[PDB]
Design a protein around this motif. Sequence first.
Motif, PDB file in Angstrom:
ATOM      1  N   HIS A  43       0.956  -1.139  -0.018  1.00 24.63           N
ATOM      2  CA  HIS A  43      -0.031   0.067  -0.020  1.00 24.63           C
ATOM      3  C   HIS A  43       0.826   1.219   0.078  1.00 24.63           C
ATOM      4  CE1 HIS A  43      -2.586   2.927   1.818  1.00 24.63           C
ATOM      5  NE2 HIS A  43      -3.486   2.397   1.153  1.00 24.63           N
ATOM      6  N   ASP A  89      -5.087   9.099   1.884  1.00 27.07           N
ATOM      7  CA  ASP A  89      -3.794   8.900   1.338  1.00 27.07           C
ATOM      8  C   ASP A  89      -3.306   9.946   0.751  1.00 27.07           C
ATOM      9  OD1 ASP A  89      -3.559   6.216   2.399  1.00 27.07           O
ATOM     10  OD2 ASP A  89      -5.290   5.468   1.031  1.00 27.07           O
ATOM     11  N   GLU A 100      -8.612   8.319  -0.976  1.00 24.19           N
ATOM     12  CA  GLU A 100      -8.249   7.358  -0.364  1.00 24.19           C
ATOM     13  C   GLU A 100      -7.809   6.069  -1.299  1.00 24.19           C
ATOM     14  OE1 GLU A 100      -7.667   6.288   2.600  1.00 24.19           O
ATOM     15  OE2 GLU A 100      -7.341   4.289   2.328  1.00 24.19           O
ATOM     16  N   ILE A 101      -6.718   5.530  -1.113  1.00 23.49           N
ATOM     17  CA  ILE A 101      -6.248   4.396  -2.119  1.00 23.49           C
ATOM     18  C   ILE A 101      -6.595   3.129  -1.302  1.00 23.49           C
ATOM     19  CG2 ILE A 101      -4.030   3.603  -3.331  1.00 23.49           C
ATOM     20  CD1 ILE A 101      -4.688   5.804  -4.523  1.00 23.49           C
ATOM     21  N   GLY A 102      -7.201   2.269  -2.060  1.00 22.58           N
ATOM     22  CA  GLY A 102      -7.160   0.904  -1.355  1.00 22.58           C
ATOM     23  C   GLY A 102      -6.430  -0.121  -2.365  1.00 22.58           C
ATOM     24  N   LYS A 115     -14.819   0.561   2.097  1.00 25.45           N
ATOM     25  CA  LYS A 115     -13.984   1.772   2.022  1.00 25.45           C
ATOM     26  C   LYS A 115     -14.958   2.958   2.095  1.00 25.45           C
ATOM     27  CE  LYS A 115      -9.622   1.226   2.158  1.00 25.45           C
ATOM     28  NZ  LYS A 115      -8.759   2.126   3.167  1.00 25.45           N
TER      29      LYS A 115
HETATM   30 MN    MN Z   1      -5.385   3.708   1.829  1.00 21.12          MN
END
Ligand code: MN
Length: 179
Positions: A43, A89, A100-102, A115
């Motif tokens: 991540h 993020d 937001e990075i998933g 999320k």
């Molecule tokens: Mn993230």
Amino acid sequence: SAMEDFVRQCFNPMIVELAEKAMKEYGEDPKIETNKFAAICTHLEVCFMYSDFGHRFEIIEGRDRIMAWTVVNSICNTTGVEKPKFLPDLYDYKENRFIEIGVTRREVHIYYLEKANKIKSEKTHIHIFSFTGEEMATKADYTLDEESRARIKTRLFTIRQEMASRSLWDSFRQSERGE
Ligand SMILES: [Mn+2]
Ligand SMILES: N#Cc1[nH]c(Br)cc(=O)c1O
Ligand SMILES: [Mn+2]
């Protein structure tokens, strides 16, 4: 002990050190929670690749909480964007929105729902990557051009295949630790 070896062999020292610091925060041992260790590193690296492909992006992830919130508050004060409830993020200066990075070992849509239900904010853009080359993003707006997303998808697939050659992928995907 193979997961730790792989982690130190495929991730650069800076990323590994940041991930170990995150685990020390959690009170977690990277020699025991090896899958979470690899997930943290993956991540982090995705976030840095994302921010580098822009300077368009401000990296919030990887900072200590003091610095992360200092930067979030600076952005909010100088843009008027509403303050997120959770540390996102990245911040996108072109679209002017937090991201937001998933990164997930499950279906991109299931993790996207997770999320979006968690952060509960219509404003933070969400972008989910899998290890199979799939993605999902708010409004299907993927922010980046096709080449950068290709680079990220390649890197994630390559991590998966490296784990596979070392017999590590099975444990890693059946675990939800790190997501
Ligand atoms: Mn993230
Ligand atoms: N901070 C933080 C954070 N923690 C988990 Br677990 C998954 C994420 O995507 C993320 O940005
Ligand atoms: Mn984060």
